[PDB]
A paper describes a structure:
Lastly, we determined the X-ray crystal structure of the porcine fVIII C2 domain bound to o-phospho-L-serine, the polar headgroup of PS, which binds to a basic cleft and makes charge-charge contact with R2320. The structure of C2:OPLS complex was determined to 1.3 Å resolution and refined to an Rwork and Rfree of 13.5% and 15.7%, respectively. Real space modeling of the OPLS ligand positions the carboxy end of OPLS 3.2 Å and 3.0 Å from the R2320 guanidino group. Within the structure, a 3.3 Å hydrogen bond is observed between the S2289 hydroxyl group and the amino moiety of OPLS while N2217 forms two amide nitrogen contacts to the phosphate group at 3.1 and 3.4 Å. The OPLS group is situated between two loops, L2210-G2214 and S2250-S2253, forming noncovalent interactions with Q2213, N2217, S2289, and R2320. Although the structure is high resolution, poor electron density is observed for the two β-hairpin loops, indicating high dynamic character. Two alternative conformations for the 2197–2200 loop were resolved in the final model to account for the flexible nature of these hydrophobic loops.
Factor VIII (fVIII) is an essential cofactor in the intrinsic pathway of the blood coagulation cascade in which activated fVIII (fVIIIa) associates to phosphatidyl-L-serine (PS) presented on the surface of activated platelet membranes. At the PS membrane surface, fVIIIa binds to activated factor IX (fIXa), forming the active intrinsic “tenase” complex which catalyzes factor X activation. Association of fVIIIa to membranes is coordinated by two tandem carboxy-terminal C domains. The C domains of fVIII, termed C1 and C2, are 16 kDa β-sandwich folds that share 66% sequence identity.
Residue numbers in the entry: 2173 to 2329
The structure:
């Protein structure tokens, strides 16, 4: 049903394929883009931008055209409790330079994301994307932006 994980949880998507607008890093911690993997545990187990604004994004380069049918999101809990993205936008690209915002009924689609730190939330993409690159744009969050992600889809051919 073209809904299988594309490699965030299982590392078929390598660390170098995951980038972001910024990430939170200092002399203690590193919430790197490549930590944005569904169900990841261990230290600093999510992507966090350096500051939480509505201009941040997490990018995945799938390295080939894929039929992308869904996106799964999760937050994270740290010492300062629960952080999660409540709402987000999606954009996509074939070349990584020109980006197309995902729409519903001709208007920007706001996806409803998480309401806690650990439960995964699956969002279908209808119409599906035939694309190489994806960006997640947080627009509402609890405490701070933090994300663990899976991308769902299949090889079109």
């Amino acid at each position: 049903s073209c809904s299988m994980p594309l490699g965030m949880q299982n590392k078929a998507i390598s660390d170098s394929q995951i980038t972001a607008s910024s990430h939170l890093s200092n002399i203690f911690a590193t919430w790197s883009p490549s930590q944005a993997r569904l169900h990841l545990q261990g230290r600093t187990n999510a992507w966090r931008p350096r500051v939480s604004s509505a201009e941040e994004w997490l990018q995945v380069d799938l390295q080939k055209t894929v039929k992308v049918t869904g996106i799964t999101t999760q937050g994270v809990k740290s010492l300062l409790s629960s952080m999660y993205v409540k709402e987000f936008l999606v954009s996509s690209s074939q070349d990584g330079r020109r980006w197309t915002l995902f729409l519903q009924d001709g208007h920007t689609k706001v996806f409803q994301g998480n309401q806690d730190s650990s439960t995964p939330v699956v969002n279908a993409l209808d119409p599906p994307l035939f694309t190489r690159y994806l960006r997640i744009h947080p627009t509402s969050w609890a405490q701070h932006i933090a994300l663990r992600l899976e991308v769902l889809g299949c090889e079109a051919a």
